[PDB]
């Protein structure tokens, strides 16, 4: 991939990671939601999908496949962030930024697929406790997801 795409991906993913850590440190301080490791069953109950990056895994590494999963996964996360609907007033600015920065990264992934000619159901959280635990889950899912796509992308070089 061109170095400028890798360099732009690095800058964009580290901002979405910083954004996610901000959401996570507020809801832990504020509502004791600090161990996303515990919320797994509840995520499962809530219906919070978890994007596969299989084609970005060594035994299945394929540039088109990895990029297309990466993007479809980012797109999903876009919906998930839309569905949290700010979580609570105190948190809606941090969600807004995270939403802006995840959308910028997904436009970049898609733009690149087009340059290469290889282009191309949402949870209901109705209580505030659902949006608060959904917010900590999605934020740490997104983080690991990105760390995965990056090691894959860096090796496609």
Swiss-Prot record:
Record keywords: Oxidoreductase included?
Answer: no
Keywords (A to Z) from UniProt: Cytokine, Disulfide bond, Glycoprotein, Growth factor, Secreted
| Gene Ontology cellular component list | extracellular space
**Residue pairs linked by disulfide bridges in the UniProt entry:** 28-34, 56-66
UniProt-listed InterPro entries: 4_helix_cytokine-like_core (IPR009079), GCSF/MGF (IPR040117), IL-6/GCSF/MGF (IPR030474), IL6/GCSF/MGF_CS (IPR030473)
Q: Which Pfam families match?
A: GCSF
Q: What post-translational modification does the entry describe? A: O-glycosylated.
Q: Record's PROSITE patterns? A: INTERLEUKIN_6
What's the chief localization of this chain? secreted
One example GO MF annotation: growth factor activity
Q: Where in the cell is it found?
A: Secreted
Tell me one GO biological process term. Answer: immune response
What does the record give as the function of this protein? Granulocyte/macrophage colony-stimulating factors are cytokines that act in hematopoiesis by controlling the production, differentiation, and function of 2 related white cell populations of the blood, the granulocytes and the monocytes-macrophages. This CSF induces granulocytes.
Its family remark reads: Belongs to the IL-6 superfamily.
Q: How does it assemble?
A: Monomer.
Task: Please report the name of this protein according to its UniProt entry.
Answer: Granulocyte colony-stimulating factor
- Native species: Canis lupus familiaris
Name of the gene: CSF3
């Amino acid at each position: 991939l061109p170095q400028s795409f890798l360099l732009k991906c690095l800058e964009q993913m580290r901002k979405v990671q910083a954004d996610g850590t901000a959401l996570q440190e507020t809801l832990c301080a504020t509502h004791q939601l600090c161990h996303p490791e515990e919320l797994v069953l509840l995520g499962h109950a809530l219906g919070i999908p978890q994007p596969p990056l299989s084609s970005c895994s060594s035994q299945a590494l394929q540039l088109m496949g990895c990029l297309r999963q990466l993007h479809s996964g980012l797109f999903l996360y876009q919906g998930l962030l839309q569905a949290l609907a700010g979580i609570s007033p105190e948190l809606a600015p941090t969600l807004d930024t995270l939403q802006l920065d995840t959308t910028d990264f997904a436009i970049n992934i898609w733009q690149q697929m087009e340059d290469l000619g290889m282009a191309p159901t949402m949870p209901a959280f109705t209580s505030a406790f659902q949006r608060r635990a959904g917010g900590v889950l999605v934020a740490s899912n997104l983080q690991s997801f990105l760390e995965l796509a990056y090691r894959a992308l860096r090796h496609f070089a």
